[PDB]
Structures are given as structure tokens and as C-alpha cells.
Design a binder for this molecule. Sequence first.
Ligand SMILES: Cc1ccc(NC(=O)c2ccc(CN3CCN(C)CC3)cc2)cc1Nc1nccc(-c2cccnc2)n1
Length: 290
Amino acid sequence: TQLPYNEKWEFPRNNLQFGKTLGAGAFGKVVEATAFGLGKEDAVLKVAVKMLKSTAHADEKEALMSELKIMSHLGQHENIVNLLGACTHGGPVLVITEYCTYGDLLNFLRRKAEAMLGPSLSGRPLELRDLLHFSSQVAQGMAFLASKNCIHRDVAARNVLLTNGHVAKIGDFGLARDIMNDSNYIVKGNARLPVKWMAPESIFDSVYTVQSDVWSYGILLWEIFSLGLNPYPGILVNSKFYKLVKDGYQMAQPAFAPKNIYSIMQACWALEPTHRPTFQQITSFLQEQA
Ligand SMILES: Cc1ccc(NC(=O)c2ccc(CN3CCN(C)CC3)cc2)cc1Nc1nccc(-c2cccnc2)n1
């Protein structure tokens, strides 16, 4: 965008020691690293570093810079993936963020479920309160983005990261996601879209607002209280699916959701955008439950 990059984030690329890859897309990837003398307190930290692959070209580079500019503009919040620094001089653009010990929320829930079933068939197990905290925290992060007039457009469990103390943060893999081979992204003409997460006005009118994010959050809520099931499971995205969503078809109550939380999901799925709850409403409600 036309936003400026502030060099207050500038970090020496030689002060990074790279480790394993945390995720990889077609033209970008995220790599774990250690930063030496990062931040006000000169900390020595494990961080995440987004960068372009050798396959990337000019457009991919302009996108990575825009993402960096946006993250600066956003500010910092406990429930988003915070920008820690950047390397824009003397080499490829490097974007440095917080490292989240437990990875994405979706995989975490799935592995946790398997580990809990283990004793019967094959750290501590999840309780309902953990799910409420996760949901509450993601809502706080989304409410923060909404207060900045910032539209996420891909709210989902795969884009939520869990850090120390199991605190959920909302992020965006962007170039570091392999959408080309991801079955959660459907080929809708020009682009590949997370259709099962999208609001009807987004699907049909290409309209993205804070409210269409609220819809997608409802789908996320479903993911959490089913412990990481695919939305609309078994249902092929086609003309019938599109028409169904448009006529108010909604998923059934997840196995682990209290009627309370499922009512919240349904509210998020109001066909009329302005009838859906705000992120601050969702936040206040969930905080009390948790
Ligand atoms: C390294 C990096 C660089 C950038 C980002 N970006 C964001 O987190 C983000 C969040 C919100 C926005 C807002 N944006 C507004 C416009 N719309 C269209 C998109 C959203 C942009 C970027 C995250 C990361 N971090 C990241 N990415 C993937 C995986 C991991 C990761 C994995 C495991 C452990 N620790 C970290 N970490």
C-alpha cells in the first residue's frame, strides 16, 4: 500500500540463525530462527521469520512488503501475532514475528483429541474451559483488528497460533500456506477461496467487512468445539452448497459446544451482516463464560 515502512523495526539479518521450516507455500515460507539482541532489552529469542522462496517474483515481494507495512500500522496486542522486526536492507525482505510454541490451533486440537483417546485405544487433557479461553482470546484479537478497521478475510483455526501458557493468537500464513494443494481452499474462478468459512455476501458479492469476518469466526467456533473437524463435513462445494448457505442452511451443534456457544455461532451466521454480533460483544460474553 502507500503506507510507509518505519525503520524502527529494522534488524540486522546477520543476527538471525535459522532453524527448521515451520510452514511453506508456493512462493513463501516461514522459518524458525534465533535473534540476537532483538528489541529494547536486546533479548536473545526464538522467532518466526517469513521470507520469499526462490520461485517468487516481483509481485510476491510487493505483497510481503505490504503485509509488513500493515503489521506496523496495526500496533501490538496480546492476541495477535506481533511483528518484532524486519530486514529490508542488503538482501531479501525478512519479516520477523513472535514464535508460538504449540503451532496452529487446528493441528493442536486434533493431536490433543488423539492423545486423549489414546489410553482407551492406544501433557494434561483439555477441559471445556480451555476451549472457552481459546475462543475468548481469538475474539479479543479480532476485536482489536476491527477497532483498527482491519479486515482479516481468512479467519480460521489454521490461522490461529498457540504460544506460551496456551494463549491463542490470530495470524495469517499468506504466502507461507500451500493453498494450491489445500483442500480447504476451493477453486472459485480467478482465485482459491476458503469457501466453507466465507459469508454469503463475500461468496456472491465479493464483499468483505468486519461482519464477514464475524461469520468466519462462527465457523472457527465450530472448529474449536468439534475439536478440529472440517466444516460442513462430507459436503461438496457446488451449486447446491452455495444455494444452501444462501437460504440459511447452518451446521448442526458441535459435540462439545454448550447450547450457549452454539447460539453464538448461529448469531454469527445471520444472513444479514448488521444483525451479527460485534467482536466486542462476543469478547465480553466469552470472557464471562471462561
Ligand atoms: C512470520 C510471520 C509474518 C507475518 C505474519 N502475518 C500475520 O500474522 C498477519 C496477521 C494479520 C494481518 C492483517 N491482514 C490484513 C489484510 N488481510 C487481507 C489479511 C490480514 C496480516 C498479517 C505472521 C507471521 N508468523 C507466522 N506465520 C506462520 C507460522 C508461524 C509460526 C508457526 C509456528 C510457530 N510460531 C510461528 N508464524
